[PDB]
Amino acid sequence: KMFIGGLSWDTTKKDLKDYFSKFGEVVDCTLKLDPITGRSRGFGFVLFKESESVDKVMDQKEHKLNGKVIDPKRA
């Protein structure tokens, strides 16, 4: 699992999970940016299915989803 900081107030587990589907497989992907439930924490989480897939997305944190970069970490 990992932590992705810098999610857009209108992000979702789909656009973030798919954006991360290019690194490997994902069993989970949360997004704390609820623009409707006032539950937007400004970041979400990502949970890949394999270790090699996680290390890859961590090889370069110069990401850019929702039109904004993020902060990938080991949760």
Kindly report the CATH number assigned to the domain that includes residue 59.
3.30.70.330
Tally of structural domains, the chain: 1
Return d(Cα 55, Cα 50) in angstroms, integer: 9
Q: How far is CA 34 from CA 5, 8, 58, in A?
A: 14, 9, 25
> Which neighbouring-strand residues pair with 65?
68
Kindly state the tokens that stand for 14.
């789909």
* Helices vs strands, H then E, count in the chain: 2, 4
Residues shown for the chain? 75
Could you give the CA distance from residue 66 to residue 75 in angstroms, rounded to a whole number? Answer: 20
Parent domain of 8:
1-75
User: What is the experimental method?
Assistant: NMR
Amino acid at 45: F
